[PDB]
Amino acid sequence: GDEVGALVFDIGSYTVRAGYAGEDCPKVDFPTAIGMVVEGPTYYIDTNALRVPRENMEAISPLKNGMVEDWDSFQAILDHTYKMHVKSEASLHPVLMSEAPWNTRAKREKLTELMFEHYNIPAFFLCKTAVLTAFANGRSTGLILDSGATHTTAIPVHDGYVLQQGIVKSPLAGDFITMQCRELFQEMNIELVPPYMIASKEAVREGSPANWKRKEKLPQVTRSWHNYMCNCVIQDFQASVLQVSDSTYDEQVAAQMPTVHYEFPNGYNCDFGAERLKIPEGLFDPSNVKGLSGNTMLGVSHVVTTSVGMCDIDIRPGLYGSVIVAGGNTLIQSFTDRLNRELSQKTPPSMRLKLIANNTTVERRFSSWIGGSILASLGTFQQMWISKQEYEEGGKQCVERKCP
Amino acid sequence: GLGDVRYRYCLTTLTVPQRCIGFARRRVGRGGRVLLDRAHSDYDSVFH
Amino acid sequence: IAALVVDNGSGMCKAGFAGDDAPRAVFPSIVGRPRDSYVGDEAQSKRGILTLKYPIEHGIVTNWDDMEKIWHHTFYNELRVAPEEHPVLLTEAPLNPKANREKMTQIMFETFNTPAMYVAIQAVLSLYASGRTTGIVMDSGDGVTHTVPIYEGYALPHAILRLDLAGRDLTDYLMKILTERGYSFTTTAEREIVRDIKEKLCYVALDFEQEMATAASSSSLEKSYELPDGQVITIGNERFRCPEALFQPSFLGMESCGIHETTFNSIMKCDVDIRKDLYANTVLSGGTTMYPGIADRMQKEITALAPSTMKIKIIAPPERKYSVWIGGSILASLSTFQQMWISKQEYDESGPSIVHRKCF
Amino acid sequence: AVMTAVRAWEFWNLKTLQEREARLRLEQEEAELLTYTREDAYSMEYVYE
Numbered sequence: 001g002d003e004v005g006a007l008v009f010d011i012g013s014y015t016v017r018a019g020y021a022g023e024d025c026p027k028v029d030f031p032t033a034i035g036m037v038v039e040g041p042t043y044y045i046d047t048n049a050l051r052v053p054r055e056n057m058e059a060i061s062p063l064k065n066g067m068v069e070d071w072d073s074f075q076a077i078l079d080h081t082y083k084m085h086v087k088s089e090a091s092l093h094p095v096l097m098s099e100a101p102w103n104t105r106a107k108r109e110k111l112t113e114l115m116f117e118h119y120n121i122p123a124f125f126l127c128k129t130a131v132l133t134a135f136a137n138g139r140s141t142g143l144i145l146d147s148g149a150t151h152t153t154a155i156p157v158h159d160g161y162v163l164q165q166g167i168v169k170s171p172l173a174g175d176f177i178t179m180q181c182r183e184l185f186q187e188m189n190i191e192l193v194p195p196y197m198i199a200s201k202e203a204v205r206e207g208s209p210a211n212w213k214r215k216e217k218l219p220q221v222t223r224s225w226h227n228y229m230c231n232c233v234i235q236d237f238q239a240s241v242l243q244v245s246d247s248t249y250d251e252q253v254a255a256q257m258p259t260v261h262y263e264f265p266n267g268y269n270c271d272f273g274a275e276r277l278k279i280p281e282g283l284f285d286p287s288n289v290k291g292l293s294g295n296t297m298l299g300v301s302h303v304v305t306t307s308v309g310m311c312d313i314d315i316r317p318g319l320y321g322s323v324i325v326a327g328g329n330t331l332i333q334s335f336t337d338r339l340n341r342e343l344s345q346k347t348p349p350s351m352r353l354k355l356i357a358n359n360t361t362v363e364r365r366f367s368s369w370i371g372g373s374i375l376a377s378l379g380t381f382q383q384m385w386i387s388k389q390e391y392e393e394g395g396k397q398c399v400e401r402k403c404p
Numbered sequence: 405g406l407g408d409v410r411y412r413y414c415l416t417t418l419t420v421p422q423r424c425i426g427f428a429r430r431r432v433g434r435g436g437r438v439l440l441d442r443a444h445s446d447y448d449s450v451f452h
Numbered sequence: 453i454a455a456l457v458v459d460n461g462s463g464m465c466k467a468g469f470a471g472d473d474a475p476r477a478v479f480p481s482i483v484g485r486p487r488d489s490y491v492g493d494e495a496q497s498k499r500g501i502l503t504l505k506y507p508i509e510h511g512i513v514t515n516w517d518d519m520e521k522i523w524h525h526t527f528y529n530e531l532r533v534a535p536e537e538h539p540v541l542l543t544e545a546p547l548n549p550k551a552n553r554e555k556m557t558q559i560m561f562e563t564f565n566t567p568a569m570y571v572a573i574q575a576v577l578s579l580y581a582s583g584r585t586t587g588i589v590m591d592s593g594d595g596v597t598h599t600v601p602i603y604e605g606y607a608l609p610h611a612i613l614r615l616d617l618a619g620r621d622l623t624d625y626l627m628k629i630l631t632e633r634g635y636s637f638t639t640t641a642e643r644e645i646v647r648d649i650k651e652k653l654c655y656v657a658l659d660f661e662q663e664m665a666t667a668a669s670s671s672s673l674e675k676s677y678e679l680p681d682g683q684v685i686t687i688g689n690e691r692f693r694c695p696e697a698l699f700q701p702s703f704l705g706m707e708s709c710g711i712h713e714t715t716f717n718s719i720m721k722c723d724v725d726i727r728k729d730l731y732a733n734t735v736l737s738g739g740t741t742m743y744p745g746i747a748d749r750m751q752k753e754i755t756a757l758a759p760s761t762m763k764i765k766i767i768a769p770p771e772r773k774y775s776v777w778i779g780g781s782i783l784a785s786l787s788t789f790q791q792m793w794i795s796k797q798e799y800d801e802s803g804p805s806i807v808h809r810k811c812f
Numbered sequence: 813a814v815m816t817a818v819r820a821w822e823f824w825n826l827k828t829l830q831e832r833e834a835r836l837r838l839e840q841e842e843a844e845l846l847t848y849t850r851e852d853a854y855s856m857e858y859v860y861e
């Protein structure tokens with residue numbers, strides 16, 4: 001027996017994962033975005049209230065790359081989480097929140113202040129998302145490549161503690177690919193019908209412009225909300241169509257390999273050939289891309305090499321024996337093997353280099369939350385939580401005295 | 405081999421399902437329950 | 453001997469023996485505290501001296517003493533069986549907190565002294581009743597509706613979506629529309645008569661605006677209904693405007709997406725690869741998912757919503773209302789399932805947490 | 813006619829046998845063992861030797 005009534009919250013750049021300690025998978029996974037309406041945050045929360053079109057409702061994100069951008073919207077996200085998805089008043093359940101290693105210490109302090117003062121939870125703890133991702137795989141010596149929508153980062157962890165200065169940050173992330181497919185849409189002129197108006201499916205054969213109708217009842221929607229929903233559509237496109245070349249992108253090979261088919265919400269459908277292989281090469285080599293191609297842009301293999309190099313050789317061999325890839329962008333088809341070859345070239349194979357296997361959507365996205373679930377139920381860890389009576393001074397002094 | 409010290413799978417034979425399961429090692433999960441892990445060894449066919 | 457399959461609905465409790473085709477004992481999950489304690493079968497008759505509580509709201513157990521009494525009634529009155537001599541299969545709503553499952557295991561083993569127990573997800577049992585390896589389950593139960601994607605029998609918890617309208621609030625909206633009709637139904641008995649009206653009359657239209665036009669043009673939609681008080685009323689336009697609320701919750705006044713839209717959402721939340729297989733296998737379970745024509749309305753709706761390239765098939769067997777209990781019976785009758793029971797030894801040594809070690 | 817029926821039955825039997833064998837292989841595909849017994853779990857049960 002090592003378990004307590006612990007809830008593990010893992011708020012990344014795209015979705016918030018809330019679940020109980022010991023659970024194999026997060027209980028709920030609903031997006032970071034949240035709705036707004038005129039009077040404070042008159043509201044709409046998850047994938048069910050954030051999608052129905054509404055009279056001039058606008059959608060924002062209280063998060064940005066993992067750092068909190070609006071603590072009131074964050075508080076209301078948490079309130080709805082507790083109210084419905086976990087449907088347990090928070091006054092009893094110990095909680096541990098995951099924060100990106102590069103998130104500010106002052107923001108950690110303010111997060112603790114909000115948590116304890118308002119929600120009056122009886123215990124608390126903090127542990128970084130990369131730390132938790134390496135926590136899931138059971139490996140002390142690990143190197144993590146986290147890549148969500150808004151940011152891609154590489155972080156090593158040894159003895160379970162991040163090399164706090166050994167952080168590499170690269171905007172070449174899910175949003176990078178999403179912008180690339182956006183400019184693809186524009187260049188070959190996809191008209192992105194949002195699914196929420198379509199009411200007919202007069203589909204058409206390949207390439208033809210499909211016919212359809214828009215529902216008369218629809219009210220006006222702020223541009224931000226429409227932008228968010230079409231962004232989700234193109235995210236589905238990212239998941240479905242994008243594929244990554246095993247080796248450096250080549251035009252003749254990219255044309256030779258069989259094309260693939262994607263259909264859009266309104267019935268418009270199109271086939272993609274070399275462009276889908278070309279696009280992730282932009283992540284693996286920013287130079288070929290439009291605009292976002294300056295030498296300042298750093299690709300995945302260069303990112304891992306930089307993160308590995310900045311730390312000395314007393315732990316670099318440990319990083320060699322395990323490369324761990326997490327986050328969304330690692331799910332682009334054949335991304336992991338491409339990264340593996342890329343590092344095998346960049347990093348001298350002269351010494352023992354291994355990857356660590358993890359594939360499915362549960363294992364990449366929620367590996368940050370799975371590590372938190374592993375910690376929360378850990379027997380020795382039960383002593384570490386910041387108690388309320390401790391919090392009285394801990395939220396200021398021991399939120400750092402305790403949680404490195 | 406590389407001599408990893410933790411992956412000590414071994415041939416084992418159960419009693420009730422009396423057969424050689426192959427490479428399996430024993431572990432204690434949550435709640436004090438002794439579990440046998442397993443490998444899908446390329447020797448799998450030899451155990452007929 | 454036989455395994456006891458007790459399905460704890462959100463207002464309707466179903467019980468029976470493993471291997472039986474239908475739940476022998478069905479009684480509303482009512483419990484009343486006098487103004488002793490009585491459960492639905494007698495509680496529904498004892499209202500005058502009684503105040504009625506429900507122990508299950510939206511499929512999640514509300515308080516545990518009332519649910520204890522519901523189980524006591526189930527066994528000792530409805531089934532007459534000794535809990536100490538039969539294995540017990542319990543079903544709980546998807547996304548049930550860990551504490552609730554642990555308390556269920558505790559209550560069973562401690563108070564009822566069951567030898568062997570198992571807690572299974574209702575949606576997966578409905579899939580078992582359907583008999584499909586992979587699928588998406590739309591279970592509009594007694595108090596809540598759940599869209600559950602299942603791959604290889606494994607429910608994907610991240611993609612499960614809850615929408616907080618179902619048969620009960622739908623009946624409340626029918627009471628609203630029925631007052632709009634000019635009648636009056638406010639009392640618990642009147643509410644149950646409106647429930648009977650819902651069961652007898654309503655249907656899910658194939659086209660909303662078209663059926664408004666038809667109702668305005670034609671009086672054929674009107675049908676007569678006889679009340680316990682002896683008078684007779686006619687129900688027309690209401691026969692589908694209330695069921696229409698399922699796909700347009702705005703009719704209820706609730707501010708969430710409809711059933712078909714939520715099914716689209718759940719499908720999207722799943723991995724892209726298996727989305728085609730989930731599309732091919734959509735199962736309609738639950739108590740209020742058996743409206744006539746609802747299957748075809750769903751079919752057209754998610755043919756429109758989904759990519760036209762993937763064949764959507766709606767599976768709604770004629771007795772889908774009990775599909776969860778039938779799945780429980782199938783599971784309990786399996787020889788391979790027998791190794792999955794939680795024995796007295798395992799609870800004694802591992803405690804209520806054992807429910808999470810082998811019983812998801 | 814009897815020769816034709818006998819040959820057709822031979823082919824039908826062969827096809828049914830191949831189908832049954834395919835079904836048996838498909839059965840074998842699933843992990844045959846998921847649990848074991850308690851007296852074969854907490855009593856050391858074996859030595860690597």
Ligand SMILES: Nc1ncnc2c1ncn2[C@@H]1O[C@H](COP(=O)(O)OP(=O)(O)OP(=O)(O)O)[C@@H](O)[C@H]1O
Pocket residue numbers: 011012013014015065066100129146147148149150151152174175235236238239240327328329330331332333364365366368
């Ligand atoms: N099949 C897919 N392959 C790759 N990316 C995908 C796929 N489906 C969705 N995505 C996008 O990948 C990202 C999913 O990861 P997510 O943003 O949730 O990561 P996270 O765990 O919160 O970490 P981080 O701190 O990096 O944001 C989102 O941008 C999502 O839109």
